[PDB]
Amino acid sequence: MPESWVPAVGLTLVPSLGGFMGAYFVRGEGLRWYAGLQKPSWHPPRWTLAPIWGTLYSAMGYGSYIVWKELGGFTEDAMVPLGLYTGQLALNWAWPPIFFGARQMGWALADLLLVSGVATATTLAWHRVSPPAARLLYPYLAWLAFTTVLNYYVWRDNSGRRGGSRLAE
Numbered sequence: 664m665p666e667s668w669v670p671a672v673g674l675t676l677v678p679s680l681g682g683f684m685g686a687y688f689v690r691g692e693g694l695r696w697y698a699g700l701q702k703p704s705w706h707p708p709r710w711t712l713a714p715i716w717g718t719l720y721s722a723m724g725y726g727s728y729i730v731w732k733e734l735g736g737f738t739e740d741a742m743v744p745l746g747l748y749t750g751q752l753a754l755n756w757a758w759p760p761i762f763f764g765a766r767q768m769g770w771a772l773a774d775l776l777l778v779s780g781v782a783t784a785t786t787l788a789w790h791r792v793s794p795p796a797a798r799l800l801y802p803y804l805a806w807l808a809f810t811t812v813l814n815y816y817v818w819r820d821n822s823g824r825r826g827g828s829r830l831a832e
């Protein structure tokens with residue numbers, strides 16, 4: 664039944680819901696909390712990147728199609744890659760603690776799950792089965808890349824107070 668593939672759309676929508684909740688914190692009252700925290704001046708509007716999921720959303724769907732092209736459809740072979748993404752992503756969903764509160768600066772946890780979670784699961788499955796699909800992710804690298812640098816600016820500003828010895832002259 665065609666319904667078997669339909670979940671592919673759901674596969675990409677699922678992760679979007681998780682990241683949204685984390686972004687919702689800084690987006691809302693967190694803004695007040697951020698007043699204490701310093702955000703890089705080159706930081707773009709919150710409503711701008713927040714929509715990124717829309718960008719990754721479509722890519723994840725079409726990317727899976729590429730995998731379907733090689734396998735010829737959904738077969739035990741196809742279940743391993745796409746299935747892993749749904750499963751591995753869920754296990755990772757359990758990692759973030761800030762989702763419940765986020766009141767604490769621990770927001771950094773969103774960064775690790777965000778980047779490694781979405782990339783680690785997709786990379787092992789799609790890359791091996793469909794290397795070309797990895798290119799489709801292209802924007803994923805840029806989006807995740809911003810969080811790495813963006814996170815240091817906020818955390819370093821506060822965390823900078825401690826671990827100063829970590830840096831050399």
Ligand SMILES: CC[C@@H](C)N(C)C(=O)c1cc2ccccc2c(-c2ccccc2Cl)n1
Binds near residue numbers: 682708712
């Ligand atoms: C803090 C500014 C955020 C909203 N920004 C401009 C982003 O591009 C962004 C988008 C996201 C989308 C999904 C999940 C997370 C983010 C995070 C982010 C990065 C590190 C820690 C916490 C968050 Cl919400 N940051």
